[PDB]
Every structure is written in structure tokens, then in C-alpha cells.
Homo-oligomer: A and B are copies of this chain.
């Protein structure tokens, strides 16, 4: 399993995530996406704040990190300002790969250019064999995007004509 830490400077309503998969397994395979908390010594903890199952069909893939699969939870994740949180990705299948981004390495679509600085300074890529003990990767971070939402006055559904 892999994980990526993040944080916010304010209180933000996380509505959905963005991830990039390089490959996937067969139709029947699935990946469990979780958001866990970060403990006082900067590591993921066993507490789980969100969880969802992503079937193979929902997982888009692409050979240039262009396809973005959107992950949605049923209850929105309320992220307190100044508190670190960690996305966690678990799957029993051995045929799942993700684009990362490592310092000093050439970009996939622009080999002429290299990632000079850290990809995301306020997060760290993690790896684990049992989803308990995490080995950090300081020079590497996942390619991801987090979406935060703002609710408005009223909503409407229209149903197709009977």
C-alpha cells in the first residue's frame, strides 16, 4: 500500500480526490481508497476518516499520466486547519501501478526537463508492506489533486420526461 500526506492552512471541506493510475488489473479487481490521520510523529495512524471502493472500470489509466480518475466519498471529509492528513491506497491485487514524481528525474512527457525541487514540499510519499509500518520517500510524491467544495443556496434535480 502507498500513501501521501497533505495539510491545509484553514478549515476546508474536501469533497473529492484526484489520482493518476499507470495501469490496472482485470475487470473484477478493485482498489480501496482511504483517508487516514497523521500522528504526532509525522506518520499515518490507524484512524480512518473516509473509505470508498473503486472498481476496475472506474479506474482510468494512461501511458502519459493524462487520465484522471476522480474518487468520491459518501460523507465529506472535513479537514481542520493545521492538521496533517494522509491519503491511503490499498489493494490486494499485484497488478496496480501509479505515477509518482521524483526529484532530479526527467518528466514523462518532457524528458528534456527534470524535476528540480521537491514535487510537493509539504507532503511525503509512503510505502508499506502491511499498511501499518510506513517507509517514507522524502524525494518523491504522488501525482494527485485534492478538490474542496463550497455549498450554495439551493439544489435542483430534473427527471427525464416519463
Contacts and interface: CB of A to CB of B under 8 A. Distances in A.
Contacts of A70: none
B143 A6 contact: no
Contact of A19 (B123, B125, B132, B144): B144
B134 A124 contact: no
B2 A146 contact: no
Interface residues of A, number: 57
A136 B138 contact: no
Contacts of A1: 127-128, 131
A130 to B, nearest CB: 6
Nearest to A46: B40
A5 B129 contact: no
Interface string A10-21: 001111111110
Interface in A108-133: 118, 120-133
Contact of A138 (B124, B128, B143): B128
Contact of A41 (B18, B41, B149): B41
Given A4-B123, A127-B138, A133-B136, 9 more contacts: A2-B127, A2-B142, A3-B125, A3-B128, A4-B144, A42-B43, A43-B134, A121-B129, A121-B130
User: Closest 8 interchain pairs by CB?
Assistant: A18-B145, A42-B132, A15-B149, A41-B43, A3-B126, A42-B133, A4-B142, A129-B138
